[PDB]
Swiss-Prot record, chains A, C:
The molecule is in a coiled coil structure that is formed by 2 polypeptide chains. The sequence exhibits a prominent seven-residues periodicity. The sequences of cardiac and skeletal muscles are identical. Homodimer. Heterodimer of an alpha (TPM1, TPM3 or TPM4) and a beta (TPM2) chain. Interacts with HRG (via the HRR domain); the interaction contributes to the antiangiogenic properties of the histidine/proline-rich region (HRR) of HRG. Interacts (via N-terminus) with LMOD2 (via N-terminus) and TMOD1 (via N-terminus). The keyword Acetylation applies. The keyword RNA-binding does not apply. The chain holds residues 212 to 270 of 284 of the full protein. It is found in: Cytoplasm, Cytoskeleton. The modification Phosphotyrosine is found at Y50. GO terms for cellular component: actin cytoskeleton; cytoplasm; muscle thin filament tropomyosin; myofibril. Induction: Induced in stimulated quiescent cells. This is Tropomyosin alpha-1 chain. Its main location: cytoplasm. The modification Phosphoserine is found at S41. GO terms for biological process: cardiac muscle contraction; in utero embryonic development; positive regulation of heart rate by epinephrine; ventricular cardiac muscle tissue morphogenesis.
From Swiss-Prot, chains B, D, E:
The modification N6-methyllysine is found at K80. InterPro entries: Actin, Actin/actin-like_CS, Actin_CS, ATPase_NBD. In vertebrates 3 main groups of actin isoforms, alpha, beta and gamma have been identified. The alpha actins are found in muscle tissues and are a major constituent of the contractile apparatus. The beta and gamma actins coexist in most cell types as components of the cytoskeleton and as mediators of internal cell motility. Actins are highly conserved proteins that are involved in various types of cell motility and are ubiquitously expressed in all eukaryotic cells. CDD domains: ASKHA_NBD_actin. Pfam families: Actin (PF00022). It catalyses: ATP + H2O = ADP + phosphate + H(+). This is Actin, alpha cardiac muscle 1. Its EC number is 3.6.4.-. The modification Methionine (R)-sulfoxide is found at M40, M43.
Length: 59, 370, 59, 370, 370
C-alpha cells in the first residue's frame, strides 16, 4: 500500500506536468506566430516610413 | 480579548480564533437523525448527531444540510451546528468573544437579521459582524484590486474590487456549486451501472468527485481521446470493496461549471460571467481587473481549472491585455484566512455591532450600518 | 513487481517532462523578449513615420 | 412492411404488430428450470420452460426473471425469451420486420448496446429502435404535455414533457415497483401465519396482491377502522384449498408506494417525487404539468390510487392550481399502445437504425444518434 | 396607395396602416429558440418563434431581444421580426406599401444604412423613410413647440423643438429605460427571497413592474412610511400559484429614473437632464419649453411620474415660470400615432426615398437628404 500511494503521487505529478507541458507548447507556438506578425508589421512600417522619407527628401 | 471567525458555508464549517493561520475546526455542516428502530436497550440513543460524528454513524442516519444555497433554511439545525462549533470543537464560551460571521452577497435580509438575533440572544456574544466572503478572500490574497471568483458548496459569485472599492452593480451571483456537481455526478454514474441514491451514498460520491475529477483543457478532443483509448480510466474503491472505474465522467462532472446547460440551467459558464462582470465595470479599471482574477473556495480546486479559465477568458477578452488567474495552493480556506486577518486589525475594532447597539435598534441594525 | 516498474516509469516520465518544461519555458521567455523588442521597434517605426508625415505636411 | 413492438418490461412481455389496438401476446417474462429428479423414462424432458408454460409447470420449476430493475441481468435467458416471443407467440420471422424495443430512462448504456447487438446479430432484424416508456405512454394518452408517472414491475419513473420537449434534468427514477410490493406482502403475511418462500409461492402472492389490495385514502383512520371492525377482511383460496383471510394487509401493501420507509428505503413517496420533478421545471410550464399527471403501468392499477395521488399532490401544490390525475382504464398497456402508434407514423420511418448503419458504426450507433 | 408605419422600439413592435387611430399589431420584439431535447417524433418542431407566440412557449425557449439599446445588434433576428410583422400580423405584401420606420436620435449611421438596405433589398418596398421618435410624439401631442421626453425600453432622450425647428445641439440621450428598471427589480427582489434568473422569469418580473410599481412623490419619507406601517405591500401571483408580496420595492424600482446611481450610473436623473437640455437652448424659447414638457413611451407610464417630474423641475427652474408636464393617457403609442399622422400628410408624399433614388445613390442616401 505504500508502493500504491507513491505510485499515486507519481501519476498525479505526471498528469499535472503533462497538462502544463501542453499548455506551454501551445503558448510557445502562439508566441512564434506573434513573432511572425511583428516581423510583418515592422516590414509594413519600414515601407511606409521609407515612402514618406522619399517624398520629403524630394520636396 | 480575542475574537472568533466562523465562516459557515453550505458544505463545511471552518471556525477558529482571530489571529491564527488556519481554522482550528473544519467539519461538515450536517445534521443526522436515525432512521431505523433501535433495539439494544441501554445504548444511549442520541436524538441527533452533528458534524463529523454524523459522518461516521453515516450508515444509519439520514443527513440534512441546514444551508441550501447560501441561505439557512433550517434554523434549529443551524443552531445545533453553532452550539456544537462553540462548545465541542472550539471549547470556548460564546459570551467572551466577538464573532465574525460570513455571508454570500445578494441573499435575503432575513438571513442576516435572524443570524444576528440568534447570536445576540441564544449565545450572548459581546459583539458580532457579518462580512462578505469575497472581500475576505481578497484580504487573504494580499491585494486591494481584483475580481474574485468564490465557488463553494452552494453558490458561485464574482465580486469586482478596485482600490478597496466595491462595484455592487457588477456583482454577479450564480447558483451552481459543489453540490450540483455532486448531483450531476450521481446521475452520470448511473449510465455506467452504479447507483447511489441515499444521502450517505451522496457523501461517497462527493469523495469520488474530490479525488478523481479534473477540468479538461479542451473538452471536445478530450472526449474523443477518452473514447479512443482507455488511459483516462481510474479506479475507486467504495467502503465495502466493490471497485468502480470511471472514464470520461472524470471531466464531464466539472465541465458543468463551463456549460451549465448540462444540468438544464440557462446561465453562462463561470468564464463568461467573469468576463461579463468585468465588462460591467468602468473602462479604466478593467485592465487591472483582467490581471487579478482571484480564485477561491473548494469548487475551484479541480486540477486544470486555472488553465481552462485563463484560456477561456483570453479567448473572450481583447488580444492585448494580460489575463492572470491567481489560484493559491490553499485557496480553499481563503475566506477564513481573510476573516482572521480582518478581525485582527486594530482599526476594525470600531466596526463590531456591540450588544448595546442591538438592544437599542433591534435586529435591523445589521444591514443598517454594518 | 508491478508497483516497482510503474513507479520507475513514472519517475522517468517525471524527469523527461521536467527537463522539457525547463527548456520550453526558457525558449518561451526568450522568444517573448524577442517579441518585446519587436514591439518596441514597431513603436520607434511608427514614431519616425509620424515625424516624416509631419515634415511632409509642413513642406 | 409492418413492424413489431416488443415492450419488454420486468414482469410481462407485451408484443404485437405496429398498427393494432392491443398487444397480441402478453405472457410473464420468466424462465423456469426443473429442480427435481425426473424418473419417467421417455417423458421428453425439456431443459427450460419460458413464458406461461413455465407458469403452469411452476410446481416443479425454479422461476427466474432475467430483468431485475429494468436492467437485463441474464442475457441468455433474455435471448430465450425473445426467441420465444418471435417464433412461438407471434409466429413470424424476425428477418422481415423492424422491431421497436423499449427501455426505462437512466439505466446503463451497455443495456441498449447489448439489445441492439443481440437484435442485429442473432435475429437479423432489418432495423430497430429503442424508445422511452414514458414518451410512448404520453403518445397513447393523446397528449403532448404532461408529467407521466410510469410504474411497472421493476422501476418507477417520472418524465415531464412540454409541447413535445423533454426535461431530462427533471427526470426522476425510483427503484421500488410491483416486485418490491410483492416481497413486502410476502413478508407481511407471515404475521398471520401464512408462509410463502418459494418462487411459485411468490407468484401466488403476486396474484393475491393483484386481487385484494387497494390504496387507502387516509392511512391512519383506515388503520383504526380495520382495527375496530372486521368489515375489511376478504378471503382468498390458494390452489389447494386452504382459504386465507387478510385484513389491513390489503392496504398496507400498496401504501409502501407513499411511504417507502416501510421497506427500509430512504426515498420519498411517489406523490412527493412527482411534486419534486414538477418543481424542478421552469416556472411557466408547471401550471400545465399540474393538470396532466398521466399514470401508466401495472403498479398504478390499485383501486383508489388516483384519489390518494390527487389528495397528496393537492396538499403539496399551491392552493390555486387544478391538479388532475389522468388514469385511463387501460393504462396497463399504454406503453405498448403508444409504441404501436409511434411505429405506425409515416414520419418515423426515417428514425429506424438500419442494418447498414449498424454495420458501419458498431453497436454504439444506438445512443450516439438514435 | 396606403403606407405602413412600423415603430420598432426595443421592447415592443407597433405596426399599422397610415391613417388609423392606433397600431393594428402590438407584440413583443422577441425571438425564441428551444433549449431542451424534443422527443415527440412528429410534433413539427419549429426552429424559432417570434412575437407573442414565443411568449406562450416561453417555458421551453430562450428569448432574445434583437435590439439592445435602440441599436439593432442581431440582423437575422430583426429580419425575422420584420418578416413576421409584414406577413403574419399585418398580412400584406411589402412590395405595395411605402414603409415609415422609426429610430432614436444619436445612434450609429450603420443602423439606418442597414435598415434601408434590408427594406429595399429583401422586401422591395416602393419607398421608405426613417423618422425621429420625438418629432412623431410631438405630432401626436398636437403641438409645434415643446421639449419631449421619450422613454421606451432601451433609451431615454430629450428633444427640444420650437416652431417646428429642432435644436440638435441640445438633444440629450440617456441609456437607462424599462429594461434596466426590470433588471434592477430582478436584483432587488432577491433581498426578499425571490429568485428570477431566466429570461422567462425576466418577462415575469417585467409584468410585476408594470402592475405594482409607482413613483413616490417624496422618496425619503415614503421610505420611512413603508418601514413604519405595512400598508404599501401588495401581493402578486406567479403563474404557478406562489403568491409574493413586495413592499418598498414598488417605488424603489422606478426611482432609478431620478437617481441613476442606484444601478451604478454616473448620469443625472431625467428631471435634471430635462432641465439641462432646456438651459442649453436660447434664452427666449425656454419660457415656452418649460410649459410644454411632453412625456412619451412606456417607461413614462408609472403612476405619479408626472407629479414628481413637475415637482423636481419646479424646484430647479426659476420661481416664476410655469412648469407644465403634459402626459396624455395614451402616451404609450404617441410615436406610432404621430407616425401615422405624418405618413398621412399630403405634403409629406415628396419626402419618401423612392426605390430609384436608392438604386442610384446606394444605402447612403438615407442620411443625405432624408
Ligand atoms: N479537492 C477538491 N476537488 C474538487 N472539489 C472539491 C475539492 N475539495 C472540495 N471540493 C468541493 O468543494 C465543496 C466544499 O467547498 P467549500 O469551500 O468548503 O464550500 P463552502 O465554502 O460552502 O463550505 C464540496 O462540495 C466539494 O464537492
Ligand atoms: N390489477 C392490479 N392491481 C395491482 N397491481 C397490479 C395489477 N396488475 C398488475 N399489477 C402489478 O404490476 C406488475 C406488472 O405490471 P407491468 O406494467 O406489466 O410491469 P412491466 O411493464 O415491468 O412488465 C406486477 O408486478 C403486478 O404486481
Ligand atoms: N403600465 C406600465 N407601467 C410601467 N412601465 C411600463 C408600463 N407599460 C410598459 N412599461 C415599460 O415600458 C417598456 C415598453 O415601452 P415601449 O414604449 O414599448 O418601449 P419601446 O418603444 O422601446 O418598445 C417595458 O419594458 C415596460 O417595462
Amino acid at each position: 500500500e505504500k508502493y500504491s500511494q507513491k505510485e499515486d503521487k507519481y501519476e498525479e505529478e505526471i498528469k499535472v506536468l503533462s497538462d502544463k507541458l501542453k499548455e506551454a507548447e501551445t503558448r510557445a507556438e502562439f508566441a512564434e506566430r506573434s513573432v511572425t506578425k511583428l516581423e510583418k508589421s515592422i516590414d509594413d512600417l519600414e515601407d511606409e516610413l521609407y515612402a514618406q522619407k522619399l517624398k520629403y527628401k524630394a520636396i | 480579548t480575542t475574537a472568533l471567525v466562523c465562516d459557515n458555508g453550505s458544505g463545511l464549517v471552518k471556525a477558529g480564533f482571530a489571529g491564527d493561520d488556519a481554522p482550528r475546526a473544519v467539519f461538515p455542516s450536517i445534521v443526522g437523525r436515525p432512521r431505523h428502530q433501535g433495539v439494544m436497550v441501554g445504548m444511549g440513543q442520541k436524538d441527533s448527531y452533528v458534524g463529523d460524528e454524523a459522518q461516521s454513524k453515516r450508515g444509519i442516519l439520514t443527513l440534512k444540510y441546514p444551508i441550501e444555497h447560501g441561505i439557512i433554511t433550517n434554523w434549529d439545525d443551524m443552531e445545533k451546528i453553532w452550539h456544537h462549533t462553540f462548545y465541542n470543537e472550539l471549547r470556548v464560551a460564546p459570551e467572551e468573544h466577538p464573532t465574525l460571521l460570513t455571508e454570500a452577497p445578494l441573499n435575503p435580509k432575513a438571513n442576516r437579521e435572524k443570524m444576528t438575533q440568534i447570536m445576540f440572544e441564544t449565545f450572548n456574544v459581546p459583539a458580532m459582524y457579518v462580512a462578505i466572503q469575497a472581500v475576505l478572500s481578497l484580504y487573504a490574497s494580499g491585494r486591494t484590486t481584483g475580481i474574485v471568483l468564490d465557488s463553494g458548496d452552494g453558490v458561485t459569485h464574482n465580486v469586482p474590487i478596485y482600490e478597496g472599492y466595491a462595484l455592487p452593480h457588477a456583482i454577479m451571483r450564480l447558483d451552481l456549486a459543489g453540490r450540483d456537481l455532486t448531483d450531476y455526478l450521481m446521475k452520470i454514474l448511473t449510465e455506467r451501472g452504479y447507483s447511489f441514491v441515499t444521502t450517505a451514498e451522496r457523501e461517497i460520491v462527493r469523495d469520488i468527485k474530490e479525488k478523481l475529477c479534473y477540468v479538461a483543457l479542451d473538452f471536445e478532443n478530450e472526449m474523443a481521446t477518452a473514447a479512443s483509448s482507455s488511459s483516462l480510466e481510474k479506479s475507486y474503491e467504495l467502503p465495502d470493496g466493490q471497485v468502480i472505474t470511471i472514464g470520461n465522467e472524470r471531466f464531464r462532472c466539472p465541465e458543468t461549471l463551463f456549460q451549465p446547460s448540462f444540468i438544464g440551467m440557462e446561465s453562462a459558464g463561470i468564464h463568461e460571467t467573469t468576463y461579463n462582470s468585468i465588462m460591467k465595470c468602468d473602462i479604466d479599471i478593467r485592465k487591472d481587473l483582467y490581471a487579478n482574477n482571484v480564485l477561491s473556495g473548494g469548487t475551484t480546486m479541480y486540477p486544470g481549472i486555472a488553465d481552462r479559465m485563463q484560456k477561456e477568458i483570453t479567448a473572450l477578452a481583447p488580444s492585448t491585455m494580460k489575463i492572470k488567474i491567481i489560484a493559491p495552493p490553499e485557496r480553499k480556506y481563503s475566506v477564513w484566512i481573510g476573516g482572521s486577518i480582518l478581525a485582527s486589525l486594530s482599526t476594525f475594532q470600531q466596526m463590531w455591532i456591540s450588544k448595546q447597539e442591538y438592544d437599542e435598534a433591534g435586529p435591523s441594525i445589521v444591514h443598517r450600518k454594518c
